[PDB]
Design a protein around this ligand. Structure first.
Ligand SMILES: Nc1ccn([C@@H]2O[C@H](COP(=O)(O)OP(=O)(O)O)[C@@H](O)[C@H]2O)c(=O)n1
Ligand SMILES: Nc1ccn([C@@H]2O[C@H](COP(=O)(O)OP(=O)(O)O)[C@@H](O)[C@H]2O)c(=O)n1
Ligand SMILES: Nc1ccn([C@@H]2O[C@H](COP(=O)(O)OP(=O)(O)O)[C@@H](O)[C@H]2O)c(=O)n1
Ligand SMILES: [Mg+2]
Ligand SMILES: [Mg+2]
Ligand SMILES: [Mg+2]
Ligand SMILES: [Mg+2]
Ligand SMILES: [Mg+2]
Ligand SMILES: [Mg+2]
Lengths: 150, 150, 150
């Protein structure tokens, strides 16, 4: 099984930035009613997609007391709960984060270690890459992710 | 086998919106020489891609009287006829549609049913998710798709 | 195993265009430190990502002599050496190039042939499709790629 997911968020100056579950020191951060963690959301959508379960907006509406105000890792762990209850064994996740700043290079080990811990995947099964937007989307963070299971 | 495909169309007020082979009531719809069904186009290219067969511009150009003016489902079914003839068995389709409006949530069931029917896949093998552009592409519909075969 | 990668470059007039390892006749070429070959960069990142090896800015800084002024095929072949050393057997590459001009259709045979030879894959395992940006990115080339191994 395969799943494909995307997420993007507007970045504004002076707001905290959350990526792969971690607070990343930054001059910019998500402008959103969620934590804006685009890695988390895209991976979450990919996992749900792999089982045709819907998407994060359908399954994690903030109108719902269980998810409102919560950080995005909660949604990802619920998604993995759901797909595991359906027999899933997650094998791999490969994703690309697109943002002009900050540079994620300095945080690469922590970021990957986070994804590995949260999805209980060995680090060679976590493929994380970073790109700038080259001026195409200077004010956003974008994430696109593929997951493989079974 | 795997294939990856993309498509996008400009959206204009008062044009019909076609997605996943359906008419979706909308204030905006594709401006294009096709029906602008981004979902079908992406899926069609992903299928063709999985066998190296080309892209929809190569195989279904509107200078070819067979294809000009045809709905995009026609192209999708021909792409599966072509891969099937080369031995493929489609297994899974996971795709993301990005558009600010209209909301596709209230049409999710219809949309997933349509893909399921057109591709002859069980609904747990149709992974459809929806995103807004968060202001990046407010006048476009975008689609990105992965397919899995055998 | 699977991997996903992306790349983009600004395009300027009076600049050579390299794609899929080839110089393409074009009125615009990448504005970039590298040769700006978005297809090769995306494919390289996808390969690296399939083994959790990092990304092209991590493995190929210009600060390392080995890589300075080097054409992108050197990066791609380094990344296949690395996954090959880990027992990988590349099975397929499927990627989408997005750019308004120049038209890539007239060069489809050459482009696919180049990828086939560089990655040592049969042509039906090279899935290449082309898209315009429909107005969204008129001065950039973008590339998004999935690789499948074993
Ligand atoms: N055209 C659209 C776009 C999104 N959506 C749903 O709207 C939700 C929220 O989309 P969004 O782009 O604002 O997502 P987030 O900010 O929650 O990351 C999705 O998860 C999809 O459920 C929709 O029904 N129709
Ligand atoms: N730079 C490009 C862009 C597109 N193309 C071909 O041009 C066609 C039409 O591209 P488009 O972005 O206008 O696609 P559609 O409107 O048909 O969805 C493709 O399906 C590719 O065959 C090309 O050869 N070179
Ligand atoms: N926000 C970001 C963006 C890119 N990067 C690293 O920055 C490098 C160069 O990014 P780029 O978008 O300029 O890539 P290229 O021009 O080399 O194709 C990478 O390949 C990623 O290592 C980062 O650490 N943090
Ligand atoms: Mg989000
Ligand atoms: Mg750069
Ligand atoms: Mg189209
Ligand atoms: Mg067009
Ligand atoms: Mg939102
Ligand atoms: Mg590049």
């Amino acid at each position: 099984r395969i799943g494909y997911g995307e997420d993007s968020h507007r970045l504004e100056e002076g707001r905290p930035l959350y990526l792969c579950g971690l607070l990343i020191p930054s001059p910019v951060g998500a402008l959103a009613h969620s934590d804006g963690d685009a890695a988390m959301h895209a991976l979450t959508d990919a996992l749900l997609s792999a089982y045709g379960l819907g998407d994060i907006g359908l399954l994690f509406p903030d109108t719902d007391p269980r998810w409102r105000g919560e950080r995005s890792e909660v949604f990802l762990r619920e998604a993995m709960r759901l797909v595991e209850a359906r027999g899933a064994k997650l094998l791999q996740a490969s994703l690309v984060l697109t943002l002009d700043r900050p540079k994620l290079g300095p945080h690469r080990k922590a970021l990957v270690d986070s994804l590995s811990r949260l999805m209980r995947l060995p680090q060679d099964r976590i493929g994380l890459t970073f790109k700038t937007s080259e001026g195409l989307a200077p004010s956003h963070v974008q994430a696109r992710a593929v997951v493989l299971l079974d």
